[PDB]
Amino acid sequence: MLQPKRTKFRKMHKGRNRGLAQGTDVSFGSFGLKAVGRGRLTARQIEAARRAMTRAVKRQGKIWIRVFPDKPITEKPLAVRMGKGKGNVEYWVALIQPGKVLYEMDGVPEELAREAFKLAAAKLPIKTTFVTKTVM
C-alpha cells in the first residue's frame, strides 16, 4: 500500500475536512474518476481500488493515481482508558474533498473505461462519477 517514505513527524492533529478540491480537470489521460462525496480514503482502499480496475483491462493503458495518503490516522488500543498519550499510527488516509480527481487512466476504449471504473467505485466509500477530459 501507499505510504510516505520519511515524513517529518510521527503523529498529526485530527483536523476538519472542509471546502472543495483543487484537482478538478482530467489533466493527464482522458478518463478520470471525480469524487462527489466528502470523506477520507485509507491506503488499503487505495490499493484495492486500483487492483480491481487494473485487472479489468488486465494490462491495458496507463493508469495514474492522483491521491496519496498524507494524514497518519492513529487508533487507541482496546481496554485502554482515555488520555495516557496519543496512540500509535495504524493507517494512512487521504482526505477527500468534493470535486477531487481520483484515479485517472488513458489508453483504453471508453465503454470499458466506464466499466472498469464501475468495478472500482464499489470498492470506494465515496460516491464518485466518471469524468472525461475536455479541451482546456
Partner: protein
C-alpha cells in the same frame, strides 16, 4: 459559428452571483481593448449544451448584446467542481 444570446447584468456581488446560478443563468466578463470591461450575463442551459464542440473554443464567438453583436474568444472556463454545470467563462474581446 456558434451564436450566444446574452445581456448586461447589474448589481453584482458574491450572493448576487449565487442568486443567479440557482436560476439557470450564470455570469461572465468580456474584456480586452482600449475600453472598459463588460460584465455580461448569459443563459446557462444554451451554452453548456454547445460547449462540447471544439468550435466553441476555436472560433470568434458571436455574442449579441442589446443589438450590438461582438466577436470574442474564450479565455478560460471556471466550471463547477463536481456538478456537471459551470460557474464562469472569460471572453477576451479578440
Amino acid at each position: 459559428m456558434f451564436t450566444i444570446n446574452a445581456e448586461v447584468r447589474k448589481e453584482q456581488g458574491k450572493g448576487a452571483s449565487r442568486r443567479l446560478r440557482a436560476a439557470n443563468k450564470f455570469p461572465a466578463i468580456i474584456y480586452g481593448g482600449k475600453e472598459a470591461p463588460l460584465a455580461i450575463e448569459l443563459d446557462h442551459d444554451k451554452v453548456m449544451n454547445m460547449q462540447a464542440k471544439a468550435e466553441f473554443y476555436s472560433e470568434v464567438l458571436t455574442i449579441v448584446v442589446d443589438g450590438k453583436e461582438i466577436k470574442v474568444k474564450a479565455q478560460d472556463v471556471q466550471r463547477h467542481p463536481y456538478k456537471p454545470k459551470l460557474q464562469h467563462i472569460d471572453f477576451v474581446r479578440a
